[PDB]
């Protein structure tokens, strides 16, 4: 019979999945995992979940699937169905849906007993997505692979590659998209909330930052244009109907702009972005100034002049704060 | 042969899944259970369901999976596939969808026959959600685990931990989110719809309250500002065009505010919050005042409508104080 | 050996599923059934479907799963996996999707052979859902259970309980919700698609009615407010500018109310509700009234009689609307 | 042992599913099929797919599942699990989802070897749903059942009932709905992806037509009402601000009408409905007439009067064409 | 026993799925594949996923499933369940969902050992869609098939048909739809995630373009009508009520046009559609009303409007030109 067929028979007719493959039960099975991010398919700041398509590969030593290549025509490694052998139950804690990814029927066995398992994960995980810096926003999400049942005495987890490689690896990442990732940071720890159970878990912090240009052109530049134009409402003659008409029309322009803002901004219930805070503050200041003009026009002057200067100074202060905040947010993002 | 392999063969060679594991059929199988809420993924007040991600673990005594460690290299406990042993039919009654949780292949067996089963559940359950206090909600609805088929003299349920410990347990809860849970309250009862049969069930009341600050900033403060502006608007005489122009400005503000609210205020079919009632009442008063001004430009109507407006704002104000008081 | 273990072996090592469990093939298997409605999750008038959560239980006599208790330590009842025995193919015809229900691994067996099977069903079924009486809706559609393949000479269906007990059963219904059920009505008939075969089917009519209060407050009362406002307005002089102003302002308000209704009224294409038709009619009648004043004021005996005719016609329409509301409530209350 | 049990053991003990049940491999397996449409659950003119709940039943001769009734207590037929026997891979083309139908565990076997398989299919398939005639629209969507792998040398398809009996079959159709079906027309043909292989397929053309009354009431009557109001508006003099205000309010009525209609007028990208074209052309005519009126007001006249009458005539002609196209669409929809 | 039954018995009694079917393990298994696009079911730019329903067929030589026809009643070909034999793990990369593909129980075997597997794939894949030219879009989305686990030393991929034939093949495409595909371009390369290992993969570039006529009728012509009317309205004086009435007329026109737009115009965060910005810009500019200063700001505004419309026209011509060729 051919080498592959009789080798597979030799291995799997004696093998019995369902028992951790160690001939000394005190020895833990060390699962060396690795993660390569392929694409951040989706990021719901509304639902506080994100969908990451990651190529996940892990290997472990199976002490029963060993053979001498000299007896089997120099076969160094062979592929066998994944469901035919014991597979560690490594699982990611913050999953929200098991995922719609395929099964990848096969795994590789090397004559040393090492089992290599490559599988794609279209995992969607709960995440603390915060849009406080909306346009210049950097999200720091994490994935935590942990042996769900087995304690560290049974299954331990480690990195396949050196940490420096996995941090900087962006070989196959789909760069085009709303998000670009700066790196995935591994971190090992012995999770434990129990009297005598310590579970090994491997955290990967996937750092991703939004690329703002579309939002810069859509929100920031028009908002800056409107805020700059609003300064002119304070150089037109103080109580003229011309000035009141100007302020009314620019308030209408701001109001219609905020509709586009509502359309464009991502929905959330955790916290409003600073951009929205400044927009609504400017709207309130403009309304107050317009009301002051309306009232003073009803009356009329000295009070009007001093109030006008006060409102102009507060408006200038607000717009300066907004611009400095934009610069600061950009500095944080880069 | 290695101890693990021959121990597994010894246990499972003659084992027969599908029979309740007791050597005296009169004894009930007591399934001790525990629940830890990991995250409240979604609360939907239109579909009246909420999705919670919970770490559910349970253990029971399987009287056939027993061995002396002396014969098996002092193997005190081992893991074997979950599908290879009898597993109790504990089910959550008010589930709406089975969920998308994984299968968790293995379970632990201790040499005394105790089987420990840990499994994550993304349960989606029906609940009597109400948004009467929308920004200051405190929802309170149950998860009840019961043996679906087996009566109490076949399967019985109990708590793994003391009730107070599970009640105060928030070790792993994912805090950052719209909902924070005040506690889960266990409660045991013998359900029955026909006297010949009694069923053991264990209710867990997950108590969660919305953290309002986002809606305080986004909804309450702009509405308060607009109400204050409309109140000040009445200092202009009705016979003055300034008043109608100012009213138009505030109606434009309310249009913008309503559009923003549409993106945020929850939809439902059972009833809107008091906040919505006050919103529409204030908008109606503003519109009626605009009609009054455009009609004038009956003078006592000015101060009458102003008093109604002042009354509404005060009612709106004390409602917020009351709702906040309940929220604490 | 323990009693349960050897009893289960004795039964299921000889037993073979697939074959209908009857030792005389000329005898049909009578499958008693029962249904308890747990909740009405979703009634969709756009898709013309509704989703109900029902606790469905059925029992039948299996003539091979019988034993003498004396031989098995007086075991008079035991549980065995549902997939280890013949399970009748009782299926629901109106189904549109099987649903998200679990599988309930086990069933009960009594020593005389009767098998008890309990299973929850998330049935979603096609139904003719008309909203003609929208606020005071009462719906009438049904669920029919029938052996999909087997004729009545193989499988016949029957009620577990007396018809009046299932009819009045509201022991577990989730009452808090948009819909309340008035009862479930069983009805047995021998369906026959082709003259050579007869099939047993058991129709359950799940009668439900909407609880209107939210829609009564949200739609009906504001609508009547607007309509009575128009009636009040008709008191103004015919050619007066006040009359035209009132008409046009009420047009704006009523149109925005129609927009609100569109936002709130359920979507459908099978048919418009009466409430909707009267709204549209009265709007059109108002537009005719408004259009009329433009000609008359532009150009008064003709105006006066024309105004009187319009006023009386609109008042008659208002009365018809109110009487329609009384009729709809009278039907829904009983 | 009981007759059923030993008969089942006699049949299925040595039965080897997977192999086509024919004892002379050269003979094809003729799979007779039938289809009864139960309900047209959803026609999606946006996505150009529809979902039809159809009761599908097929039978074929299995040469190995044969027995002599006298030897087994005179049993003429029995039911056995569907997964225990060879089942032809008759598959519908142009599907978009495998469907949400159950598994129907059992099939009937008759002693001659005929296997009967009844199964409900929640098929969702692609057809070119052209809504040109939207309110009075008749769609001719098709289902084709074909042995996905096996060529005609292995599996051949045929009708269970006479073609006219299936063409006029509405025995169990759920008629209360937006769509009513005029019939399903069978048509056999031998497809050939490459001339070396010939594939037998059975096309059923399900013909369905929208019942318009809802759309009549909600769209066409209000549209006629607004158009008649616009025709009335032309009586007012062009020089009058009354006419300008009337036209502005009528245009606002147009706007609100279309706003509400957006909920019900189907979305699509294959082509605009004819009624939509008339809507937009009347809207544009109204707008341009109003603009000309405003300009002539600015001037304020002979040319003004001539253009007023000309625009009135064009509007009247457009309304006449609208009536003609409505009656035409209705005439086609009747047949 | 009948020929088919005992032939299946001979083949499958000692056959054991799992082992790559070669009697000399050093030989790679060459999986010839072919792909025919049947329909482009969806192009979702908001999620950047494209859904195509494609007829996928592949064949390979299984060196264990061989027989002499003379011994088995001259049977040259037979069908056996797909689950009963080794099947290569040819996986399409950049999938998003495994998809609603049916199981297709059977495959053909020919006495020389060739296995033919036909299966329909409803692949939904993530690829870079863009609506920069919305009404005149042309998209270039890839499908790449690769043996997920096996390296090129185990599984190698090739085309069933000649590249030009598969490229120009549009025999079964559902042509009556929003999208028409120009062709599918195959391309073979040895992917390498590590220096020591090489993976064979086969990219098919599906090239599709939106057919615009609907959007020309629905969007472009009405928008040009409204823009031309806005230009015309400038001749009414800047202080006059005639201009106000004209502006309200135009505003109602835009009110209808924008709901029509919202019902059809796609939106995504990757970038803007050049056509889309003008609509909202012009609708917003009705706010503008910019006596000595006003009368000349009006001419400035008129120049702005005219240049905007000129840019719109040349943009439409450009978009059509890049879409035609
Ligand atoms: C579980 O695995 C971790 C990771 O491999 C082990 O931690 C390493 O221990 C070695 C000891 O020589 C150190 O050199 C490494 O620096 C450690 N790595 C990290 C990330 O801390 C851990 O010792 C293992 N524990 C058990 C019980 O097997
Ligand atoms: C994302 O979060 C991770 C984890 O908190 C940060 O990584 C830590 O950074 C600090 C400061 O440089 C170090 O002292 C820790 O050792 C890091 N942890 C690990 C596991 O490497 C990371 O800096 C954050 N990045 C961003 C952009 O927020
Ligand atoms: C089923 O389980 C319940 C819950 O543990 C048992 O109820 C307890 O019984 C013990 C008996 O010693 C009491 O001390 C506890 O106070 C009971 N707890 C509660 C919450 O009632 C019950 O006895 C078990 N058996 C049966 C037949 O119900
Ligand atoms: C949530 O609902 C539960 C169930 O009604 C409440 O728990 C009960 O509260 C009452 C009043 O304090 C006690 O008498 C009962 O003993 C409690 N039952 C249990 C099982 O603990 C709970 O107080 C509610 N919480 C909120 C915040 O509404
Ligand atoms: C729902 O439909 C059922 C079936 O038509 C109605 O029940 C029938 O009502 C008629 C008239 O009262 C009786 O003669 C039948 O005997 C009833 N059938 C059964 C099985 O009881 C029922 O009335 C409908 N619901 C409503 C609210 O009208
Ligand atoms: C199938 O089952 C139904 C329901 O049990 C049978 O109908 C009953 O027939 C008996 C005959 O005496 C009547 O007394 C009952 O009132 C009937 N019940 C109902 C609900 O109508 C029916 O006879 C059975 N048919 C066969 C062929 O066995
Ligand atoms: C495959 O089946 C079709 C349909 O039954 C066969 O076509 C019919 O064959 C009969 C007998 O020759 C003719 O009377 C009919 O006119 C044919 N057409 C139809 C529509 O019935 C066809 O011959 C079969 N082919 C094979 C190879 O079995
Ligand atoms: C739907 O399409 C079918 C298939 O083209 C039409 O049926 C054909 O009609 C022509 C009319 O000349 C006949 O010559 C063919 O013989 C018919 N074929 C079949 C299989 O019956 C049908 O008329 C169309 N119906 C509608 C309403 O469009
Ligand atoms: C794997 O398959 C590819 C084809 O997909 C082989 O490449 C071909 O090799 C032949 C050798 O004569 C050339 O004529 C073709 O031009 C090649 N095609 C391409 C697309 O490069 C390749 O040799 C096979 N084996 C390996 C190890 O890659
Ligand atoms: C779609 O992308 C493919 C791949 O880049 C293009 O096809 C290649 O184009 C280059 C440049 O003209 C040629 O050198 C190659 O021979 C082409 N084929 C392959 C397989 O690379 C194709 O032109 C693109 N189509 C569109 C419309 O952008
Ligand atoms: C394995 O291959 C080497 C040459 O590469 C050969 O010398 C050796 O004999 C082979 N093994 C056996 C068992 O023949
Ligand atoms: C098992 O444990 C007992 C108690 O500690 C000890 O005496 C014995 O030597 C152990 N046996 C083995 C094989 O470890
Ligand atoms: C079974 O129950 C009967 C009473 O019904 C009793 O007499 C008998 O002893 C019991 N048998 C056993 C083995 O307990
Ligand atoms: C077998 O059944 C047929 C049909 O019912 C009947 O005519 C025949 O007499 C029966 N024969 C025997 C031996 O039962
Ligand atoms: C077997 O079939 C082939 C098909 O071409 C034919 O040429 C050959 O003569 C046949 N041989 C026998 C023995 O039937």
From Swiss-Prot, chain D:
The chain crosses the membrane at residues 212-238, 244-262, 273-291, 314-333. SUPFAM superfamilies: Neurotransmitter-gated ion-channel transmembrane pore, Nicotinic receptor ligand binding domain-like. It is a multi-pass membrane protein. Glycans are attached at residues 74, 140, 156. CDD domains: LGIC_ECD_5-HT3A, LGIC_TM_5-HT3. GO terms for cellular component: cleavage furrow; neuron projection; plasma membrane; postsynaptic membrane; serotonin-activated cation-selective channel complex; synapse; transmembrane transporter complex. Changing residue 148 to S: Abolished 5-hydroxytryptamine (serotonin) binding to the heteromeric receptor. Residues 239-243 are cytoplasmic. InterPro entries: 5HT3_rcpt, 5HT3_rcpt_A, LGIC_TM_5-HT3, Neur_chan_lig-bd, Neur_chan_lig-bd_sf, Neur_channel, Neuro-gated_channel_TM_sf, Neuro_actylchol_rec. It is found in: Postsynaptic cell membrane; Cell membrane. Residues 1-211, 263-272, 334-335 are extracellular. It catalyses: Na(+)(in) = Na(+)(out); K(+)(in) = K(+)(out); Ca(2+)(in) = Ca(2+)(out); Mg(2+)(in) = Mg(2+)(out). One of its GO terms (molecular function) is serotonin-gated monoatomic cation channel activity. The keyword Transport applies. Its main location: membrane. It comes from the Eukaryota. Expressed in cerebral cortex, amygdala, hippocampus, and testis. Detected in monocytes of the spleen and tonsil, in small and large intestine, uterus, prostate, ovary and placenta. Disulfide bonds join 127-141. Keywords: Cell membrane, Disulfide bond, Glycoprotein, Ion channel, Ion transport, Ligand-gated ion channel, Membrane, Postsynaptic cell membrane, Receptor, Signal, Synapse, Transmembrane, Transmembrane helix, Transport. One of its GO terms (biological process) is regulation of membrane potential. Forms serotonin (5-hydroxytryptamine/5-HT3)-activated cation-selective channel complexes, which when activated cause fast, depolarizing responses in neurons. The HA-stretch region of HTR3A seems to be responsible for the low conductance of HTR3A homomers compared to that of HTR3A/HTR3B heteromers. Forms homopentameric as well as heteropentameric serotonin-activated cation-selective channel complexes with HTR3B or HTR3C or HTR3D or HTR3E. The homomeric complex is functional but exhibits low conductance with modified voltage dependence, and decreased agonist and antagonist affinity. Heteropentameric complexes display properties which resemble that of neuronal serotonin-activated channels in vivo. Interacts with RIC3. Belongs to the ligand-gated ion channel (TC 1.A.9) family. 5-hydroxytryptamine receptor (TC 1.A.9.2) subfamily. HTR3A sub-subfamily. This is 5-hydroxytryptamine receptor 3A.
UniProtKB/Swiss-Prot annotation, chain E:
The HA-stretch region of HTR3A seems to be responsible for the low conductance of HTR3A homomers compared to that of HTR3A/HTR3B heteromers. Belongs to the ligand-gated ion channel (TC 1.A.9) family. 5-hydroxytryptamine receptor (TC 1.A.9.2) subfamily. HTR3A sub-subfamily. Disulfide bonds join 127-141. NCBIfam families: LIC. It is a multi-pass membrane protein. Forms homopentameric as well as heteropentameric serotonin-activated cation-selective channel complexes with HTR3B or HTR3C or HTR3D or HTR3E. The homomeric complex is functional but exhibits low conductance with modified voltage dependence, and decreased agonist and antagonist affinity. Heteropentameric complexes display properties which resemble that of neuronal serotonin-activated channels in vivo. Interacts with RIC3. The chain crosses the membrane at residues 212-238, 244-262, 273-290, 304-323. This is 5-hydroxytryptamine receptor 3A. It comes from Homo sapiens (Human). Coiled coil: none annotated. Forms serotonin (5-hydroxytryptamine/5-HT3)-activated cation-selective channel complexes, which when activated cause fast, depolarizing responses in neurons. It catalyses: Na(+)(in) = Na(+)(out); K(+)(in) = K(+)(out); Ca(2+)(in) = Ca(2+)(out); Mg(2+)(in) = Mg(2+)(out). Residues 239-243 are cytoplasmic.
